[PDB]
Design a binder for this molecule. Structure first.
Ligand SMILES: Nc1ncnc2c1ncn2[C@@H]1O[C@H](COP(=O)(O)O)[C@@H](O)[C@H]1O
Ligand SMILES: Nc1ncnc2c1ncn2[C@@H]1O[C@H](COP(=O)(O)O)[C@@H](O)[C@H]1O
Ligand SMILES: N[C@@H](CCCC[NH3+])C(=O)O
Ligand SMILES: N[C@@H](CCCC[NH3+])C(=O)O
Ligand code: NA
Lengths: 506, 505
RNA sequence: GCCCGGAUAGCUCAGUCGGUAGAGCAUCAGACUUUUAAUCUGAGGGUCCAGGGUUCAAGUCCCUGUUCGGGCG
């Protein structure tokens, strides 16, 4: 019964509390963890009893078998590993205490065992208890579901239940933490300095992404949540710290879907006296080392549409394949499109749209050249990016805050890393020209951010900082969630998030 | 004058750009870092000139001086280091580009020099330049003062200028980063797991504060920003992860002063099958190891107000002082305050009132015994906690989420680490009882509806999580900003914050 | 808003030609000093999605609907 069981258990616990039987002791001394116990006392043979050694462990019961009136088998489960407890009356303190403690213990209870190691006749590492102490009773029902919980609605809304019933989520979160730690260690070894930029920006920014508007009553003014720490990192680089990095949280006021969250974690770093070609090797080394360290090898098997779908085997050998966008795109399209310098020309946009219509592709109602190309590169180039692949310089239309090409015309010095036909690493070459940056900010604000409103989306403080002299520097960004999904074989962003945002019920 | 200088420099840069030459080169092949350069070539005898290799360094000019018309001395500052360059016509590429680049360069510009290491006979390490390349001109005029900019407004609003002129700011930020790194490493080697709890909640909860309300567009709902990542950690512990930790940002809708900020960073961990007395040693080892590893010794000199005032000396010797709150309060007062058990409602209120009137402690909100006794313990106990000191066994009605004392009654199982008369970290013994927890949450909700503003609402998810069974756990929380303030001899939070949130113009 | 098929113990489903609701899972009680998804025995558990007509007798016919899966606006 869903309701009657809770009421009965609550009444029993209240009765225990009434007659001087506390079910919530303040302290229990866990001498040894379950993992250490299993590692140490696994050398025992079947049917042994190490009566000399007595240790204290604690854990949550996951099963209760009644082989008789005086023999009860519990299954403690902690640290992701199980351990059987064989409660026998003859080895307990007393028969009365044995039958008293066994009555009050059920599945899911948090208990503390104090006993001697050994094994049964069949052979299993078990601790024969001398005195079982209840630590935290479980009032609610714990279902005994084989193969784990499968309803993908209480797994995300009740994460503790998912951790209790399912065991792979702990491995997923451990892998995510290990990824974060590896990134921190690598960037610290390279000499970077970890920083913490403000999350409450006065100016929202000329970005398309909707900001989370917040009101400050003491200063009676509107604060906008952080979208990217880019401007503050570049300000610090102007200040003198040539290498900065930050693995922080960015908030976006967009919808919630399979692979999108209102808040997410991104690792962003900026290094001075470098460029995208300099960061290509760094990204290669970091990604290959992370794949080799988290897993056991460079090979990773991913299921983009669940286990029942197609399994893709990617190889993370350090020599990633590098393809330049325009030379590869023209080949993939099958025809050579007009030169890059004709980006602004309407004729190039019309002919490119003719190509898209000829190849039967779909484009957003805005028919700008940026949309057409981003669609062309996303459905003829990244499709062949099953293995990790570097996409080179992109036209100046898409990336505003990237310097022009060293030799080519109208090409931003930037690169992207595509794995599993998805974008994980983006790296630009910072624009240190104050006049060009000012013009770009003004035009970006006037275009969409301030199309029919006040032109305040420009950051005068950042332009003033750039006026003081920014060294030739290069940035790099990483979406930690995407890498976590790729390394944990997860096709949902909610599988790698501890408490993902969900639509409220009722 | 600064406007005229900006106009002239902007015109000069436009003239530079129009006639082919590019004042913003795309990439400079920096070969060797400035600090490495100094460390490697400090062995040079004054007067040597290694005219056999060429190294390319980069930096920012901060002073120029022409010793005639052929020799020009610059001094680059990079990673907080000094490299004096003596450009001369003889070793340059040729005279014409030499005079051209000397006319083009000014003070504050960011340049890159390719040359040969050496040292003048005076004894100053230098790099003889073969070709000086200008990387980023400085349009504005850098102030020339031999002490660095001192106006607090200019220092905080323009942090890049502070880093450019002042030198201790970089050291302060490095110390803060090392604090965070040491905490992370210690907690990781203890076996903890780093987690990322949501910063947006449907309802407020976690600690007494005023939340930042935000509106969600797609889903018509108000999200309250994170105040403390406390409930989610306990839900995770219920899930099965015994040890968790998180160093993260918390947002508070208070005012802005020299100590408090709208946003700050704190480190919070939770350990299962432990208690506050178990954390009393862990946090002591934390603090002692941090101070030893960062400062270099166990003794710190801290100025409570200004570098010209009294300079207190705080010793972080690992055997800290553990003081009982009630016992020490009685010792300071002498008179025996009636026992915590009775709580003597409407009796001890008068008692504390006579103490505040006689002992002369100001009582702005005289309501409730909580405010009054907090006032007494502030004016009589934490004033002498120069060295780090644990203050344990606080009254129950102080803490709404600390388990009751096992031996005593009416006392909560908690301690606070007071260093330099300020709390840095505190620990709690978690209340795993679901019925008590629901009762206390109901009291908090009643206070929030009428009686309090910082109280939380009823979080039914956490109530269900506690109903599912929470082990006996202990929580610990430290304010990173105050530790950074103490370890960098800073009396203002804005010093340890990269971009402190000042009031607008 | 048009149309198709279901609505059964705490959960998943048989229910047959209408001869009164059962099987499994779950809970509880009992037996079983060596089990491992513990093994049996027993009990409670819905009052047939709601209202009706029909039938000797209606979950097991028909008529109005609500809900669900939806095929469609
Ligand atoms: N709403 C969102 N939810 C999750 N991840 C996001 C969201 N918006 C952006 N990202 C991630 O942000 C990273 C950088 O994206 P971009 O700013 O477009 O370069 C990528 O890894 C994206 O997946
Ligand atoms: N508005 C604020 N700005 C900065 N620090 C604060 C603010 N409010 C509280 N704190 C400090 O942050 C910490 C919060 O409590 P705890 O994390 O338990 O130490 C304490 O050190 C507080 O003094
Ligand atoms: N902010 C960028 C980093 C690239 C360099 C910025 N110019 C990102 O989100 O990845
Ligand atoms: N942030 C709390 C943790 C304990 C949670 C409430 N019992 C502290 O450091 O005191
Ligand atoms: Na049965």
């Amino acid at each position: 019964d869903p309701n009657q069981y809770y009421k009965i258990r609550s009444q029993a616990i209240h009765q225990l509390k009434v007659n001087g039987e506390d079910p919530y002791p303040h302290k229990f001394h866990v001498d040894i963890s379950l993992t250490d116990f299993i590692q140490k006392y696994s050398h025992l043979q079947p049917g042994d009893h190490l009566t000399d050694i007595t240790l204290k462990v604690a854990g949550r019961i996951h099963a209760k078998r009644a082989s008789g009136g005086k023999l009860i088998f519990y299954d403690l489960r902690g640290e992701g590993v199980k351990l059987q407890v064989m409660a026998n009356s003859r080895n307990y303190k007393s028969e009365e205490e044995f039958i008293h403690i066994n009555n009050k213990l059920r599945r899911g209870d948090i208990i503390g065992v104090q006993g001697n190691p050994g094994k049964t006749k069949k052979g299993e590492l078990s601790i024969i208890p001398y005195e079982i102490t209840l630590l935290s009773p479980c009032l609610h029902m714990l279902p005994h579901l084989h193969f784990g919980l499968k309803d993908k609605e209480t797994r995300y809304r009740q994460r503790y239940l998912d951790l209790i019933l399912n065991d792979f989520v702990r491995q997923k979160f451990i892998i995510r933490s290990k990824i974060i730690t590896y990134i921190r260690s690598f960037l610290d070894e390279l000499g970077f300095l970890e920083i913490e930029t403000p999350m409450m920006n006065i100016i929202p920014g000329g970005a398309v992404a909707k900001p989370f508007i917040t009101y400050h009553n003491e200063l009676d003014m509107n604060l906008y949540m952080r979208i990217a720490p880019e401007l503050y990192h570049k300000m610090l680089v102007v200040g003198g710290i040539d290498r900065v990095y930050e693995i922080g949280r960015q908030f976006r006021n967009e919808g919630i879907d399979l692979t999108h969250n209102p808040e997410f974690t991104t690792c962003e770093f900026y290094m001075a006296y470098a460029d995208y070609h300099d960061l290509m090797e760094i990204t290669e080394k970091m990604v290959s080392g992370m794949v080799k360290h988290i897993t056991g090898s460079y090979k990773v098997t991913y299921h983009p549409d669940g286990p029942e779908g197609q399994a893709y085997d990617v190889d993370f050998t350090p020599p990633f394949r590098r393809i330049n966008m325009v030379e590869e795109l023209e080949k993939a399209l099958g025809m050579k499109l007009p030169e890059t310098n004709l980006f602004e020309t309407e004729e190039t946009r019309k002919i490119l749209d003719d190509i898209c219509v000829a190849k039967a592709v779909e484009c957003p109602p805005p028919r700008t050249t940026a949309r057409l190309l981003d669609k062309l590169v996303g459905e003829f180039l990244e499709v062949t990016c099953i293995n990790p692949t570097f996409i080179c310089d992109h036209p100046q239309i898409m990336s505003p805050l990237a310097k022009w090409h060293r030799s080519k015309e109208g090409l931003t010095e930037r690169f992207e890393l595509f794995v599993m036909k998805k974008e994980i690493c983006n790296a630009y070459t910072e624009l240190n020209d104050p006049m060009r940056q000012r013009q770009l900010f003004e035009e970006q604000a006037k275009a969409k951010a301030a199309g029919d409103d006040e032109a305040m989306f420009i950051d005068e403080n950042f332009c003033t900082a750039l006026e003081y002299g920014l060294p030739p520097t290069a940035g790099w960004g990483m979406g930690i969630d995407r890498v976590a999904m790729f390394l944990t074989d997860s096709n949902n962003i909610k599988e790698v998030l501890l408490f993902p945002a969900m639509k409220p019920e009722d």
